[PDB]
Structure 1
């Protein structure tokens, strides 16, 4: 039935491949949760599907169509179930349109994820499973998709979503802005912010033959000194892309909010509360554009593949800026040595964003790197991103790739960090 996630066993639909969300979201009063939505999903299937089953938590569906025709549907508990006129089979696609309105609901986690409302702002901060609050979706990272979003807001407000901004139209005191996310990312990586905000472009960044556009969002009311330092994002894109491969998206920037919250690596536009706005955090979120947004999780138990890689990116950045990488690893280790440890595959919701997922995962990569040397390690990161582009990653699959690409000894080095209940000793040269 569901995707069968080991942590969130009810989310998603087994076999469903949502390929594109075409969302028209209308927010009448930014900062208050009520909203209305009109979305068309382009869906395929990995196995014959007799129904399309989507996650939805709060809003109520009022109408549904399949390929532009009337269709049988029911909203039950936390799902919308659409009965198809005949099975959707692999290689076919159909267009599921849903009209809905109401109040998104917020879901051991670091935050209560979903559609946030505070201080005249409404915005998605939905990792892991909050997007279903404001968007009927297959809400699981194993099924990324592209997004086209039209956001309608009062004329006095503005909006920003993941994807290149094209047009803004206005009538009867309402503005509609269109954003196009052209590379597929998980549902929670869809950035979407409405309220008093301004879009500010910066010069394109050249990464060899690749061009990366630049823009940041500045919400009104930011603390004095809330900035994106000039030249920094270009330097980071160069350092990380030289380690990981081409930047996966068409644009990058941050959306700075005057709120007090964790930063989230929403696609091409990181949602950045000002309280988290630090150089290392900006690097970390940019690293997620590869590790989490492009390379997506098959199962929420494997969050260390996102958080541990993004954390290790901080050490690569530090070294690129002349700092001592081994000292940073020792800092990570000192932090863990007085905390409980766990194998890296999580078994409980409380664990998926705990210290082990970030810092034990990063030290696992440090151990691997020290085993194989920097040339092999960088080649491996390139191969890893390629191997798991279009294919959700797992801890088992990573170990297989290390074994085949780097050999049995390297796999054993990583496995000691992946498995085992006690914290291994600090990896040293």
Structure 2
């Protein structure tokens, strides 16, 4: 019934394909966890579904409709189960509307320093929900194998403002409440939905032209940022140019960061990375932008494969550094030095504690480094382009990566990657 994730075996619904979330979120007091929601999901199915089973953790559903009609539904501790009048069958779509309100719950953190979900701090409420926190404030198929598009209408006090992933279109004001509308038009995982409410400023920059593609530029600055918390002019443009030349077209219509005066890790929310000021460094800004491809466009089939996101986004930092004239092998050697004094593992994680560990970042990055040195920069660059296209609209797995390497780069290239993917001991440092 669930997706059957190796790490989180209860999340999601098997065969469920949510294509679009139309969310109206109302935050009465930014900084306080209470909220209310009105969401319509446009859902498809990959296998016949007699029910729609969504993840929800905290708020209480008060009403549900299926294609405009009253429908039978029950809410458990962590699920909303909607009995459909008839099975939803592949090729068909329906619209599930849920009315809900209450207090989002944070998913317990046994792996990361973040308890993921709806965060409340310093007059700010915002999503920091990787891996399974989005269900706290949004009834969702909470699994990266099912990305979707989002249209979000956020209602906040007039004194406040809001920013969500996607292009900002309208703001209206009535009875002391503002409503802002954002349109995420390319599909991303549930946790990649950025959503921040409170005292925030929108700042635009000139468009970035990437040969037959225009990328809009805007950052968000919340109040109370430390002195010197900035995105310096033109850096995002040069990063977009270097990364897209390596990976292919930037998958979204806008990019920027939302700089927050809190102390947490950066999260790669789509087209608008949620960036605590503590993490606002050049390498982290590159890292988060690389995730727009690897993580947000290319999504995981299973949470055990986080290195396909974290390792790829980490290696992009080395590709960027070399683009700025730096010595990439030295950076690779530094990564290796840091891993050499830590326990190592195969890249496919077996436990939740591992999915964001040092192996996922740096052993994954060095896995790509081994492959690149084996096949050369030209072949490696064409593989990255082929990889992104192969796994757009189809979730990626470690096995599928190795199969792709075998057909595209050959059996020797595949076994080079396999030494780094499999095997408990950390292999020697990859060298030219």
TM-score scaled by length of structure 1: 1.00
The alpha-carbon deviation at position 110 of structure 1 amounts to 3.0
Deviations 1:284-338 (A, max 9, x none): 0000000000000000000000000000000000000000000000000000000
Distance 2:33 2:187 in 1: 27
Aligned length: 429
Distance 1:260 1:91 in 2: 45
Specify every segment of 5 or more residues in structure 1 that has no aligned partner in the other structure, as ranges.
none
- SS state at 2:415 partner: helix
- Equivalent residue, structure 1, for 2:53: 53
Structure 1 position 242 matched with structure 2 position 245:
yes
- SS state at 1:17 partner: strand
Distance 1:224 1:326 in 2: 34
Deviations 1:171-212 (A, max 9, x none): 000000000000000000000000000101000000001000
Distance 1:172 1:319 in 2: 54
- SS state at 2:311 partner: helix
- Equivalent residue, structure 2, for 1:402: 405
Deviations 1:6-51 (A, max 9, x none): 0000000000000000000000000000000000000000000000
The alpha-carbon deviation at position 74 of structure 1 amounts to 0.2
- Equivalent residue, structure 1, for 2:232: 229
- Equivalent residue, structure 2, for 1:31: 31
- Equivalent residue, structure 2, for 1:99: 99
CA contact (8 A) 1:223 1:274 kept: yes
Deviations 1:104-159 (A, max 9, x none): 00012331000000100000000000000000000000000000000000000000
CA contact (8 A) 1:168 1:175 kept: yes
Distance 1:336 1:251 in 2: 35
Distance 1:109 1:359 in 2: 16
- Equivalent residue, structure 2, for 1:175: 178
Distance 2:337 2:121 in 1: 37
Distance 2:225 2:328 in 1: 33
Deviations 1:43-83 (A, max 9, x none): 00000000000000000000000000000000011000000
- Equivalent residue, structure 2, for 1:350: 353
CA contact (8 A) 1:142 1:299 kept: yes
Distance 2:366 2:272 in 1: 28
Distance 1:267 1:182 in 2: 10
The alpha-carbon deviation at position 242 of structure 1 amounts to 0.2
Distance 1:338 1:197 in 2: 42
CA contact (8 A) 1:109 1:349 kept: no
Deviations 1:362-415 (A, max 9, x none): 000000000000000000000000000000000000000000000000000000
Deviations 1:234-282 (A, max 9, x none): 0000000000000000000000000000000000000000000000000
Distance 1:14 1:77 in 2: 19
CA contact (8 A) 1:34 1:102 kept: yes
CA contact (8 A) 1:58 1:133 kept: yes
Mean alpha-carbon deviation: is it higher for 105-114 or for 4-13? 105-114
The alpha-carbon deviation at position 94 of structure 1 amounts to 0.1
Structure 1 position 83 matched with structure 2 position 83:
yes
Distance 1:31 1:347 in 2: 36
CA contact (8 A) 1:110 1:353 kept: no
- SS state at 2:290 partner: helix
Distance 1:9 1:47 in 2: 19
Distance 2:212 2:410 in 1: 33
Distance 1:76 1:32 in 2: 24
CA contact (8 A) 1:291 1:309 kept: yes
TM-score scaled by length of structure 2: 0.99
Specify every segment of 5 or more residues in structure 2 that has no aligned partner in the other structure, as ranges.
none
Distance 2:338 2:154 in 1: 43
